[PDB]
C-alpha cells in the first residue's frame, strides 16, 4: 500500500501490525479550525480583486 506505515518489532524485526492514518506530522500549522475572524463587507473598494 503506498505510504503505508507498519509496526515493526524492535528485537527480531518482524511485522506487528499495519498502522493507521498516513504520514502527517506537524499538522498544527495546518487545519486552522477557526472560521470566524472577519466578514466580507469590511474590505471595500477592491471589488474587482474580490
Partner 1 sequence: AVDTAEQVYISSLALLKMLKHGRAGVPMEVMGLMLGEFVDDYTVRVIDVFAMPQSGTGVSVEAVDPVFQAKMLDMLKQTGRPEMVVGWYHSHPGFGCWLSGVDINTQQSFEALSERAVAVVVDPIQSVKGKVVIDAFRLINANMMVLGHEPRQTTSNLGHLNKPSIQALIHGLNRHYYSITINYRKNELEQKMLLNLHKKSWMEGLTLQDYSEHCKHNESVVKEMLELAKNYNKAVEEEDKMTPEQLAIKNVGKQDPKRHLEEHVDVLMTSNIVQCLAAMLDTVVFK
Partner 2 sequence: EFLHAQEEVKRIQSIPLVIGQFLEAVDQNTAIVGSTTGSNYYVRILSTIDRELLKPNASVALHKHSNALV
By a kind-dependent CB cut-off of 5 to 8 A, residue 25 interacts, out of partner 2, partner 1, none, with partner 2
Nearer to partner 1, 11 or 37 (CB): 11
Picking from 50, 42, 5, 2, the residue whose alpha carbon sits closest to that of residue 25 is: 5
| Interacting residue with partner 1 among 11, 24, 33, 41 (CB under 8 A) | 11
Cβ-contact 15, 8 below 8 angstroms: yes
Picking from 25, 20, 24, the residue whose alpha carbon sits closest to that of residue 1 is: 20
**Footprint on this chain of partner 2 (rule: CB under 8 A):** 7-8, 16, 19-21, 25-26, 28
Amino acid at each position: 500500500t503506498p505510504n503505508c506505515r507498519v509496526a515493526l518489532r524492535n528485537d527480531s524485526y518482524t511485522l506487528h501490525k499495519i498502522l493507521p492514518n498516513k504520514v502527517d506530522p506537524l499538522v498544527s500549522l495546518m487545519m486552522v479550525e477557526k472560521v470566524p475572524d472577519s466578514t466580507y463587507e469590511m474590505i471595500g473598494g477592491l471589488d474587482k480583486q474580490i
